[PDB]
Design a protein around this ligand. Structure first.
Ligand SMILES: *[C@@H]1O[C@H](CO)[C@@H](O)[C@H](O)[C@H]1NC(C)=O
Lengths: 229, 213, 194
């Protein structure tokens, strides 16, 4: 079954070139379909960028035509996107997707519907540098205990650009996990927190480890949260 | 700003049926039958609900359905549920211009038991203190409506410096949640006998306190 | 006495869709048809003029080489007097045909994992094709009273569909490359002999 995955630089300098690639697996791009890029500025609407099929033919959104190139490399089985002269209006989550229709000659091919979507990679356009997150454990205590339940967490402090994603115990702790939106500090660096609610009886016996991933650098920090002294 | 005009919000009550419209011109919607609807839940990738006007992808509930008349497309959700609370975007081909989107429409499920904020306040961890920083973290969750005021107190006097608070955000349970952080020097954490976070919502206030050692 | 470039039709990497069948004109060259007939790597080699061994001793003013990809089922339709979606809307041999019809299985090359959608065939056409005609139009077939106005709709269908070749398909649904060799003789000296 087909899978799409975007990768690329988390951060880009203003007026330089944004360069993301999408690696297909489970289906040879050359074998059919159109393949497209669609972006979503933070808290704003979907924008379609461009599509391409294996020959190299392209269709582009008129407002971004002068700055956009989409390429295909069939030997690596991936398609890529470059966008030049970036501004803050290019700060966005960038998705790659596959079309509904496999026939490449259908009317409005690659400009109809998109069936299979990637997770999305985010790109922030800024002059600031990337900073790695620092991870501090928010320990369980008798004040955070509430009867049978109890709350512990992970504070992810002074990182940039977005995003950070947190999973707990390698994805076995999923329920009661809330991971809050980040706040922007005066320094310019983001911070955010992840809290989970856990059985109070099990606090000394059970293991709780938060898995902070910050893909703009290449950091992944796993912090063990233990009860207080 | 969007060449397809879509109502900013729409709502319905559970069990009932809600319809979102999407108007373009005779050169997009009115011109071709390549009209597509997507459903995006907060923080997740868009999902295709409807292609080629009324055609349903596999795995999409029959409750969803779309249609079109003239310049205006419609997406009708029957048997409205809480899991349907999301943003919906419409799309269509535009000839010379290609693949234009609508601005989107937020759909609310309108079942709204008023909830109260649960508050948990974490003191500066000992790791942070050794790095010569101190951060108070007050976390606010599971509260409806999505309306909240946070005040911090040092001892009993008010504090307005270094407070950063996130706008409230929708969870999976369609309730809301927000976070407030107090940035502090470590000597300040040790000077004052107690810090406290007060979280007001619908007149009543929940206040939690942390104290050094 | 140059050699006929039969290799560049048969062994070509890329083959055309039946609806836009390729034609190559052969001339001013000598060709050994007998190596072709005895290859046995062709699953199909029917001739409707004279036996393949005898035309080795025959001259022609021109040899036309038509190439395309179809399904196993449809190979029988590449013949004179044959009816079917291929023979009526895609490629029709006349009944006076004097040539050979050659094919081999291309599952290894032309079938892909999620379906290959490059190869098309014409699903709807208003009239049956005349012999040796080629239609590549993309006008929307009108299958109902409602006029199509050029827009895909209900009873308005894009006139071409695709074999979605998968290597797991049964034989009959597997891709077959086809080469049709038509031998023409005009009031002009011959340029293709053996
Ligand atoms: C196709 O290639 C094979 C191997 O190179 C060769 O033996 C054969 O003669 C070629 N076919 C033609 C028609 O030249």
């Amino acid at each position: 079954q087909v899978q799409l995955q975007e990768s690329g630089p988390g951060l880009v300098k203003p007026s330089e070139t944004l360069s993301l690639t999408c690696t297909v697996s489970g289906y040879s791009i050359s074998s059919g379909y159109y393949w497209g890029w669609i972006r979503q500025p933070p808290g704003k609407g979907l924008e379609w960028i461009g599509s391409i099929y294996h020959s190299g033919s392209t269709y582009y959104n008129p407002s971004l035509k002068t700055r956009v190139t989409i390429s295909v490399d069939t030997s690596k089985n991936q398609f890529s996107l470059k966008l030049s002269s970036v501004t803050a209006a290019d700060t966005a989550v960038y998705y790659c997707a596959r079309a509904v229709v496999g026939i490449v000659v259908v009317p409005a091919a690659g400009r109809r519907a998109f069936d299979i979507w990637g997770q999305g990679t985010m790109v922030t356009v800024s002059s600031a540098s990337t900073k790695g997150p620092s991870v501090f454990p928010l320990a369980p205590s008798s004040k955070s205990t509430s009867g049978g339940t109890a709350a512990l967490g992970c504070l992810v402090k002074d990182y940039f650009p977005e995003p950070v994603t947190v999973s707990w115990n390698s994805g076995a702790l999923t329920s009661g996990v809330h991971t809050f939106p980040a706040v922007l500090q005066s320094s310019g660096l983001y911070s955010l927190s992840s809290v989970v609610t856990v059985p109070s009886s099990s606090l000394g016996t059970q293991t709780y480890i938060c898995n902070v991933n910050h893909k703009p650098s290449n950091t992944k920090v796993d912090k063990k949260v233990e009860p207080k002294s | 700003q969007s060449a397809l005009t879509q109502p900013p919000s729409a709502s319905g009550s559970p069990g009932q049926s809600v319809t979102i419209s999407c108007t373009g011109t005779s050169s997009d919607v009115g011109g071709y039958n390549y009209v597509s609807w997507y459903q995006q839940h907060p923080g997740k990738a868009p999902k295709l609900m409807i292609y080629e006007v009324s055609k349903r992808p596999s795995g999409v509930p029959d409750r969803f359905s779309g249609s079109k008349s003239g310049n205006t497309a419609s997406l009708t959700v029957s048997g409205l549920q809480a899991e349907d609370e999301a943003d919906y975007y419409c799309s269509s081909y535009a000839g010379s211009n290609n693949l234009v989107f609508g601005g989107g429409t937020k759909l609310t499920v309108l079942g709204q038991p008023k909830a109260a904020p649960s508050v948990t306040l974490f003191p500066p961890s000992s790791e942070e203190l050794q790095a010569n920083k101190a951060t108070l973290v007050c976390l606010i969750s599971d509260f409806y409506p999505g309306a909240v005021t946070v005040a911090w107190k040092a001892d009993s006097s008010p504090v307005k410096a270094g407070v950063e608070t996130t706008t409230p955000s929708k969870q999976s349970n369609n309730k809301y949640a927000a976070s407030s952080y107090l940035s502090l020097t470590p000597e300040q954490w040790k000077s004052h006998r107690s810090y406290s976070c007060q979280v007001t919502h619908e007149g009543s206030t929940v206040e939690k306190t942390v104290a050094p050692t | 006495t140059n050699l006929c470039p039969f290799g560049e039709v048969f062994n070509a990497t890329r083959f055309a869709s039946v609806y836009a069948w390729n034609r190559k004109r052969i001339s001013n060259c000598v060709a050994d048809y007998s190596v072709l007939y005895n290859s046995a790597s062709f699953s199909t080699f029917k001739c409707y003029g004279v036996s393949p061994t005898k035309l080795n001793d025959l001259c022609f003013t021109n040899v036309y080489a038509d190439s395309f990809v179809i399904r196993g089922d449809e190979v029988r339709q590449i013949a004179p007097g044959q009816t079917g979606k291929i023979a009526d809307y895609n490629y029709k041999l006349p009944d006076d045909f004097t040539g050979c019809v050659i094919a081999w299985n291309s599952n290894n090359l032309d079938s892909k994992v999620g379906g290959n959608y490059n190869y098309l065939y014409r699903l709807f056409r208003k009239s049956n094709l005349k012999p040796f005609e080629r239609d590549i139009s993309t006008e929307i077939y009108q299958a109902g009273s409602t006029p199509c106005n050029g827009v895909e709709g209900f009873n308005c269908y894009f006139p071409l569909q695709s074999y979605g070749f998968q290597p797991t398909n049964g034989v009959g649904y597997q891709p077959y490359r086809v080469v049709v060799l038509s031998f023409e003789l005009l009031h002009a000296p011959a340029t293709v002999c053996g």
